[PDB]
Amino acid sequence: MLTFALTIVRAGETQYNRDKLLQGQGIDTPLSDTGHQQAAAAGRYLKDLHFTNVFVSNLQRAIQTAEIILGNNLHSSATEMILDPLLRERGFGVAEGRPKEHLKNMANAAGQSCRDYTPPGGETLEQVKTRFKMFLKSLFQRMFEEHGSAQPVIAGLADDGAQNVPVHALMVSHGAFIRISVRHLVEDLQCCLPAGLKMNQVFSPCPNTGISRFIFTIHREESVLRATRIQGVFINRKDHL
């Protein structure tokens, strides 16, 4: 109707990951050398895939990660890299630039758990979730426009779940945004899970340039595009590291 693969990759490391500082949207700096190497390893890993569509956070570390992946790709040089602010990392407001532990301290000082707490000038979970839902609606519209009309095999390889799926989007984003996105796919939209992936495993944090994959089936429910099936394939893969 339209079936398409979505590969999701977290940005590479900046200078600030090493120090375990909260980056969010307000720390917008380039990849470290490690970051470059992570992105290059991810690019070699995915080099045999044709990405028909590429969507990227407009934060620099995400842009560069995507550039390096595409620069390593054997098939996707004609693909325009779409910059989408909807893919930006969760904003952590005044907490940005502080070590990650400080966020815990602020939460505790406000009598709230970390899941409940939003620092001044940051986004709530609901706000980020809203950005992913908007991205998704926009994703479905763009994918059906270019590609639409009226069980995954998991071998431990770069093309798992997508060996014979020609329509393939790449999404390059950030750790907290990706975590929230996966949660929406898994919890809200109740996507199928493969091979021993369950609730417990699916919610682990994605490492820098960690790679996840879902297969979407979509159609027109009389003028409204909806997913008739979302199939998880793999989450947070880092073999290339």
Curated annotation (Swiss-Prot):
Site feature (Transition state stabilizer) residues: 174
Keywords (A to Z) from UniProt: Apoptosis, Autophagy, Cytoplasm, Hydrolase, Mitochondrion, Nucleus
UniProt cross-references to Gene3D superfamilies, sorted A to Z: Phosphoglycerate mutase-like
Reactions this protein catalyses: beta-D-fructose 2,6-bisphosphate + H2O = beta-D-fructose 6-phosphate + phosphate
Subcellular location: Cytoplasm; Nucleus; Mitochondrion
Active site annotation, chain numbering: 11, 89
Family: Belongs to the phosphoglycerate mutase family.
Annotated function: Fructose-bisphosphatase hydrolyzing fructose-2,6-bisphosphate as well as fructose-1,6-bisphosphate. Acts as a negative regulator of glycolysis by lowering intracellular levels of fructose-2,6-bisphosphate in a p53/TP53-dependent manner, resulting in the pentose phosphate pathway (PPP) activation and NADPH production. Contributes to the generation of reduced glutathione to cause a decrease in intracellular reactive oxygen species (ROS) content, correlating with its ability to protect cells from oxidative or metabolic stress-induced cell death. May play a role in mitophagy inhibition.
GO cellular component: cytoplasm; cytosol; mitochondrial outer membrane; mitochondrion; nucleus
Protein name: Fructose-2,6-bisphosphatase TIGAR B
Lineage: Eukaryota, Metazoa, Chordata, Craniata, Vertebrata
UniProt-listed Pfam families: His_Phos_1
PANTHER family named among the record's database cross-references: FRUCTOSE-2,6-BISPHOSPHATASE TIGAR (PTHR46517), FRUCTOSE-2,6-BISPHOSPHATASE TIGAR B (PTHR46517:SF2)
Matches recorded under CDD domains: HP_PGM_like
Annotated coiled-coil segments of the chain: none
UniProt xrefs under InterPro entries: His_Pase_superF_clade-1, His_PPase_superfam, PG/BPGM_mutase_AS, Phosphoglycerate_Mutase
A biological process term (GO) from this entry: regulation of pentose-phosphate shunt
Domain of life: Eukaryota
Any GO molecular function: fructose-2,6-bisphosphate 2-phosphatase activity
EC number annotated for this UniProt entry: 3.1.3.46
